[PDB]
Write a protein that binds this ligand. Structure first.
Ligand SMILES: COc1c(F)c(F)cc(C(=O)O)c1F
Lengths: 237, 300
């Protein structure tokens, strides 16, 4: 059934599973036309498909050409997502295919279910968790590869860099969701926190800075403060 | 005009014959129902006064034989039986009519209700949904499950309605996932109408039978089947025009006939609101929409 706070450790067991977030699939800028009406212009998007146990990220870039001449794009985007996730599963060797796919938005259930009919033993699950994966495009190297794309493209990353050499999947997922929640709540301040120090750099093959264990404690605390500050503003509390 | 004599009425029971119903007292001298119109299927049905659970009954067509009811004290129910000896049967009925021990199928001449509810229902199709080939008539009751309900346990006691499942490979062509799911026309017209039912009359027949089992027996799987067959049509963008017009007539009489006090359980809010107000055919069911609005505006 639905994934929630009760069964949170199930994410880090040895049954292969994938989170699928479709928030950034169909991205537009709304603008005015010469005649004074409003129009959208699409920009490149992506499906965020993530193994929370291993950090493997399957970033399917959705090029604006996929929307050309199509109607009801927000609806189509869900079916395109499901089509690409199904294609990804088909492309994996059997022993790498997930046993479960967890969609961050419930509106993805029926499209993914219908596209996965050939895989009746893969469970399609919603979640009650409010995950911050929409902020994936605040990660500079992910945003850069999406915007630069000139065609449909799959790009593979490990969203945990090398953290699993020193910490567990549970702790790595918690750090990720904290970083993304911070970027989602106040991108400018979060990026300030991550790159303020010019002597801490990002490896060419990484997404995040090369913090020591103790600097990660400091960074994590700064992120939690940023989220609390923002929250006191939001509600005036 | 045919007759279904009763041997006796040993236990107090409400007897229905199509949309009519009579209360018979324990050992009241009741010996059957005469003047049954030829040309239509019929259903005789029972609800015992002492266990108002298990409505049960028999679908039959008097053109197919001489049928009578007899109470079985071992199995505790009124059973339909076929009498092979015509002179016996005619003599038995003749006697019973002379003693005026039979009620009369109380059809108003102006009334087409029963025809309108059973227009496409054939006995031969009922007998394939209800499989008991040694009888010419078909027993149905409140508790019988459908093949689809079973898949999700006694096979010889099931309602073999055609399985409809909008998220199945049968319903969804590979490569047309979004198309077939949002527009069920290929599943309606190619899979169901051209492939399985062969024509729209057999489709409407099963739809009508499903509704009647839901209304008369409270059979829940039949109500599921009725709604699924409505939803499949309304969710298709491409439906033959004669089918939409016929459908509107079919549902109008079904909604007209439903007991007012049963709308809560026999009518699925989601299906009806989608069919009348959101679906492709939201504008093709004027008579059904109008009766539903004036009779059950709460459900909507
Ligand atoms: C209704 O009484 C009938 C009847 F009409 C009939 F055809 C047969 C029997 C019987 O048991 O053989 C019977 F009692």
């Amino acid at each position: 059934g639905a994934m929630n706070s009760s069964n949170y450790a199930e994410l880090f067991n040895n049954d292969i599973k994938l989170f699928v977030d479709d928030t950034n699939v169909y991205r537009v800028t709304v603008h005015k036309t010469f005649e004074g009406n409003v129009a959208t212009k699409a920009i490149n998007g992506c499906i965020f498909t993530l193994n929370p146990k291993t950090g493997h990220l399957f970033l399917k870039i959705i090029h604006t050409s996929v929307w050309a001449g199509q109607k009801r794009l927000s609806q189509l985007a869900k079916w395109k997502t499901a089509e690409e996730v199904s294609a990804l599963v088909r492309s994996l060797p059997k022993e790498e295919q997930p046993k479960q796919i967890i969609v961050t938005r419930k509106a993805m259930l029926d499209p993914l279910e219908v596209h996965m009919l050939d895989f009746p033993n893969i469970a399609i699950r919603p979640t009650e968790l409010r995950l911050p994966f929409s902020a994936a495009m605040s990660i500079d190297k992910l945003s850069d590869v999406v915007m630069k794309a000139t065609e449909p493209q799959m790009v593979l990353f490990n969203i945990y860099d090398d953290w699993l050499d020193r910490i567990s999947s549970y702790t790595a997922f918690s750090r990720l969701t904290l970083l993304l929640r911070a970027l989602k709540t106040n991108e400018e301040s979060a990026k300030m926190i991550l790159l303020s120090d010019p002597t801490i750099t990002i490896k060419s093959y990484h997404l995040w800075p090369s913090f020591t264990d103790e600097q990660w404690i400091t960074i994590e605390s700064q992120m939690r403060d940023l989220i609390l500050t923002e929250y006191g503003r939001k509600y005036n509390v | 005009m045919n007759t279904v004599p009763f041997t006796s009425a040993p236990i107090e029971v409400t007897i229905g014959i199509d949309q009519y119903s009579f209360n018979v007292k324990e050992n009241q001298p009741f010996h059957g129902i005469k003047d049954i119109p030829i040309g239509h299927v019929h259903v005789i049905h029972f609800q015992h006064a002492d266990n108002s659970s298990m409505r049960y009954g028999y679908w039959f067509d008097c053109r197919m034989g001489n049928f009578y009811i007899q109470y079985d004290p071992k199995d505790g129910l009124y059973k339909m039986m076929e009498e092979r000896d015509g002179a016996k049967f005619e003599n038995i009925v003749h006697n019973f009519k002379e003693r005026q021990m039979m009620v009369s199928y109380p059809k108003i001449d102006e009334d087409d209700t029963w025809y309108n509810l059973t227009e496409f229902v054939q006995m031969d199709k009922i007998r394939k949904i209800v499989r008991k080939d040694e009888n010419q008539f078909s027993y149905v009751d409140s508790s019988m499950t459908t093949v689809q309900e079973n898949e999700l346990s006694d096979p010889a006691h099931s309602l073999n309605y055609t399985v409809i499942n909008f998220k199945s490979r049968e319903a969804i062509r590979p490569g047309h996932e979004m198309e077939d799911f949002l527009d069920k026309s290929y599943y309606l017209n190619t899979v169901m109408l051209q492939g399985i039912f062969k024509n729209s009359s057999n489709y409407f027949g099963e739809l009508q039978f499903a509704f009647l089992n839901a209304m008369f027996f409270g059979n829940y799987g039949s109500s599921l089947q009725w709604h699924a067959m409505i939803e499949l049509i309304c969710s298709s963008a491409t439906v033959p025009k004669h089918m939409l017009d016929k459908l509107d007539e079919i549902l109008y009489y079904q909604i007209k006939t439903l007991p007012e006090q049963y709308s809560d359980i026999l009518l699925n809010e989601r299906v009806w609101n989608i069919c009348l107000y959101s679906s492709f055919q939201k504008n093709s069911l004027h008579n059904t929409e109008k009766i539903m609005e004036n009779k059950y505006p709460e459900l909507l």
